[PDB]
């Protein structure tokens, strides 16, 4: 339970913040 | 020839396809070299 619950929140920290920061630099560079 | 320049042209496409895939992974390693150089620069920062 601690595995699946935390990994889902760790994914929410990994997926969200990455797509945000990546979409920021990618489309604003060119 | 037609065996041939179209067949060998298909051979030149697979290489360029793998080269494009290699060029992708090259660009995948270009920002990865930056992420490597970043932490390597931080490796110089902890020594700084």
């Amino acid at each position: 339970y601690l595995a699946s619950l935390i990994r889902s929140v760790v994914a929410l920290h990994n997926l969200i913040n990455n797509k945000i920061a990546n979409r920021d630099a990618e489309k604003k560079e060119g | 020839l037609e065996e041939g320049k179209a067949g060998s042209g298909l051979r030149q496409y697979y290489l360029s396809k793998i080269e494009e895939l290699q060029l992708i992974v090259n660009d995948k390693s270009q920002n990865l070299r930056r992420l490597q150089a970043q932490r390597n620069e931080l490796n110089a920062k902890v020594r700084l």
Binding site: L5, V9, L12, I16, I20 | -
Partner: protein, 52 residues
């Protein structure tokens, strides 16, 4: 009114008291996951606006 924790039995006529109030795994998790949805929904304004 929470002043009494227990349950009865109508068939054999026995009132049985049982309690396990504390759960620290479920409550501290699900509340944050619901809050985690508010963190993404508030960021959906950033997502959709920067793209178009």
């Amino acid at each position: 009114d929470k002043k009494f924790h227990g349950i009865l039995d109508q068939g054999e006529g026995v009132l049985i008291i049982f309690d396990e109030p504390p759960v620290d795994k479920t409550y501290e998790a699900a509340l944050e996951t619901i809050q985690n949805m508010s963190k993404v929904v508030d960021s959906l304004y950033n997502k959709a606006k920067k793209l178009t």
